[PDB]
Design a protein around this ligand. Structure first.
Ligand SMILES: O=c1cc(N2CCc3n[nH]c(-c4ccncc4)c3C2)cc[nH]1
Length: 331
């Protein structure tokens, strides 16, 4: 027979994983679902080809190391990793993970959410984020397609390729004008998107991203623009005419007033004044779900043993080969 082929990509994951079906592709690689003949369930398999680029090698190693350390209901795990028997033959890495039903991006394209479901999904996002932040880790790329959902509305955060120890539509202003507050801004954008089924700040480019933000928040104050900022971005913001602030209730007239109060606190221009994860979980909007006795935190802060940014890609490939050795049948 041979290895299965999907949308031009070889998925060399047999004999254990068969009956492959395409899910999607993006900067993370290509994801298929497959039948696991050992556990007798369908799983997700992500194929990555990172070895030609130092940056892609860093991302692959960071994701593996973080996801194999983390253990939380609202965070995707890694169940298995497939790669070649020798480092010379290793060109691709297959990360096997729990298969979910859909992601929030696809769900929001076809479904109107009830207030109770928006509240429940926001709670799960924040519960997972509380764990990530408690480990001194930033996700850095929270968006609807990175939030996975199963048939019983369990939510898991995935894609830790850009995660670090503490689409541009979900990027915080401080990222564009230059911490944990960058993830809170992304969560605020996702909340706004759940309230209206449309992105709140759909910029076509960086200047347009700034214009969409100021279009709702209004012109930034002197305090908002006093810190370290890119000179070009500061000059651009100063060259703009005054913009009025749009009240949240005008943008989301049918939303729960408590949801808009929390939205206001997450979508704060100044990161020093933006609400933190624990305070967001304790907000009255989340009162029905908030359960501090059932919101685990990391046992210790996450730490990489080596300076990964400094390592040549050949060294990173050896570390990836070493990290994945434990999954080799038979180790
Ligand atoms: O890193 C990553 C990992 C990703 N996935 C692999 C894990 C997973 N389980 N279920 C799904 C799924 C996604 C969409 N519709 C149905 C199921 C995925 C998607 C995606 C982006 N980035």
């Amino acid at each position: 027979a041979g290895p299965e082929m999907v949308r031009g990509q070889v998925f060399d994951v047999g004999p254990r994983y068969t009956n492959l079906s395409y899910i999607g592709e993006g900067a993370y690689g290509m994801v298929c679902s497959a039948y696991d003949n050992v556990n007798k369930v369908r799983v997700a398999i992500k194929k990555i080809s990172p070895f030609e680029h130092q940056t892609y090698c860093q991302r692959t190693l960071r994701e593996i190391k973080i996801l194999l350390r983390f253990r939380h209901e609202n965070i995707i795990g890694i169940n298995d990793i497939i790669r070649a028997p020798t480092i010379e033959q290793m060109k691709d890495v297959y990360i096997v993970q729990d298969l979910m039903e859909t992601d929030l991006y696809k769900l929001l394209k076809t479904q109107h959410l009830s207030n109770d479901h928006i509240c429940y999904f926001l709670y799960q996002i924040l519960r997972g984020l509380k764990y990530i932040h408690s480990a001194n880790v930033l996700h850095r790329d929270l968006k609807p397609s990175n939030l996975l959902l199963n048939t019983t509305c369990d939510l898991k955060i995935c894609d830790f390729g850009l995660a670090r120890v503490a689409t541009r539509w979900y990027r915080a202003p401080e990222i564009m004008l230059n911490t944990k507050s960058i993830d809170i801004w992304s969560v605020g954008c996702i909340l706004a998107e759940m309230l209206s089924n449309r992105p709140i700040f759909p910029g076509k480019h960086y200047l347009d991203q700034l214009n969409h933000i100021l279009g709702i928040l209004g012109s930034p104050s002197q305090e908002d623009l006093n810190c370290i900022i890119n000179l070009k971005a500061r000059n651009y913001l100063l060259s703009l005419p005054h913009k009025n602030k749009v009240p949240w209730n005008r943008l989301f007239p049918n939303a729960d007033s408590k949801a808009l109060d929390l939205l206001d606190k997450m979508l704060t221009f100044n990161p020093h004044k933006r609400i933190e994860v624990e305070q967001a979980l304790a907000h009255p909007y989340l009162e029905q779900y908030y359960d501090p006795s059932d919101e685990p935190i990391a046992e210790a802060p996450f730490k990489f043993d080596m300076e990964l940014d400094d390592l040549p890609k050949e060294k990173l490939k050896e570390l990836i080969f070493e990290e994945t050795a434990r999954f080799q049948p038979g180790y």
